[PDB]
Ligand binder design. Structure first.
Ligand code: BLG
Ligand SMILES: CC(=O)N[C@@H]1[C@@H](O)[C@H](O[C@@H]2O[C@H](CO)[C@@H](O)[C@H](O)[C@H]2NC(C)=O)[C@@H](CO)O[C@@H]1O
Ligand code: CA
Length: 312
């Protein structure tokens, strides 16, 4: 009947003689009441995926922006985005009212992330997270905390840690939430009492809550294209310049910037030259989801492209 197996102190699998795995097991038992033998049986089935390690290590004008953009903004994609928007219009409108994050932004996020649920990932979250926690020193602490949180999520939401699949970094569902993002920002938007990242309605409200929690200002502008070139200045979402500095560099806003006294300098490689943008606070917020200028511009433009296609 009851099999404590106090003596089975040694697990097999790819993490058997791994000190990190043992320390992690100790932590989970001590800190959360996890049973060592149960956890060992789980981690013994965990796999050390070398590809997850090679991929994390791997992370002019030649048209760079255009190549990234065509991966997400195509007729097929925009069309699929319209379908997703109409199918979940109530959930999107309700997220707009509760969090102040517009439907196009959520449609854009979920679009760039999983093509509205068509590409959720094929890697078991446990394998990816265990690999990065135990065989990847550089970000071993971050990922260990992700693994720690994933295992508590499996317990709380009554999931099997081995059945859940996602990205090579362990991101999950429609919005590709990392375990800690789930813990801090996910919400039961569907109202069934359970926070499921694979439920389109939950992902929608969770993406909006994540945005609001990261500073999204309702009604404010994301980015404003500029007339002109400013080759002297450095660029990226991390940069910061006053409007006065940008004007003196040869730029003018195609749209009124209002009370915005500062902006970042975004530069997109459009093949024939460079396209300059005034990055406003809301664009910085989009990058809090995924630290990339290209990622955020794709999310924004796809959302806008889908928004237009609905009107037509
Ligand atoms: C919504 C969400 O959970 N965003 C998190 C993001 O996930 C990214 C990770 C990425 C991912 O899974 N990348 C793997 C690469 S591949 O596509 O499988 O090849 N997708 C997710 C959503 O955009 O990773 C960064 C950095 O870890 C996190 O920032 S941090 O807290 O400061 O660390 C951020 O919170
Ligand atoms: C080569 C290519 O075009 N790949 C696409 C992937 O980039 C997409 O994967 C998703 O990309 C975002 C942005 O980096 C990640 O944050 C997210 O985790 C990732 N999703 C998954 C499940 O791994 C994919 C979905 O749009 O579509 C292409 O395969
Ligand atoms: Ca739910």
């Amino acid at each position: 009947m009851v099999e404590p197996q106090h003596n089975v102190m040694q697990m097999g699998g790819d993490f058997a003689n791994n000190p990190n795995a043992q320390q992690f097991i100790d932590k989970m038992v001590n800190k959360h009441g996890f049973d060592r033998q149960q956890l060992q049986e789980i981690l013994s089935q965990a796999k050390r995926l070398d590809s997850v390690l090679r991929l994390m290590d791997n992370q002019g004008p030649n048209g760079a922006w255009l190549r990234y953009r065509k991966k997400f903004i195509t007729p097929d994609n925009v069309q699929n985005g319209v379908v997703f928007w109409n199918q979940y219009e109530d959930a999107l409108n309700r997220a707009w009212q509760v969090y102040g994050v517009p439907p196009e932004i959520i449609v854009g996020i979920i679009g760039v992330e999983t093509r509205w649920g068509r590409v959720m990932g094929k890697t078991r979250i446990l394998d990816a997270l265990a690999t990065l926690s135990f065989n990847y020193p550089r970000r071993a602490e971050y990922f260990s905390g992700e693994l720690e949180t994933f295992l508590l999520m499996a317990r709380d939401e009554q999931d099997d840690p081995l059945n859940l699949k996602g990205s090579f970094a362990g991101a999950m569902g429609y919005g590709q939430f990392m375990p800690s993002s789930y813990k801090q920002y996910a919400v039961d938007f569907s109202g069934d009492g359970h926070i499921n990242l694979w439920d389109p309605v939950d992902a929608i409200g969770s993406v909006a809550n994540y945005f609001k929690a990261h500073g999204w200002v309702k009604g404010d502008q994301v980015a404003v294209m500029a007339n002109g070139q400013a080759p002297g200045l450095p660029n990226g979402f991390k940069t910061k310049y006053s409007i006065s500095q940008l004007a003196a560099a040869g730029l003018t806003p195609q749209q009124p910037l209002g009370n915005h006294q500062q902006a970042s300098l975004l530069r997109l490689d459009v093949g024939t030259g460079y396209q300059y943008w005034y990055g406003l606070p809301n664009f910085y917020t989009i990058t809090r989801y995924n630290h990339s200028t290209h990622y955020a511009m794709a999310v924004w433009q796809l959302g806008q492209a889908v928004a237009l296609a609905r009107v037509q």
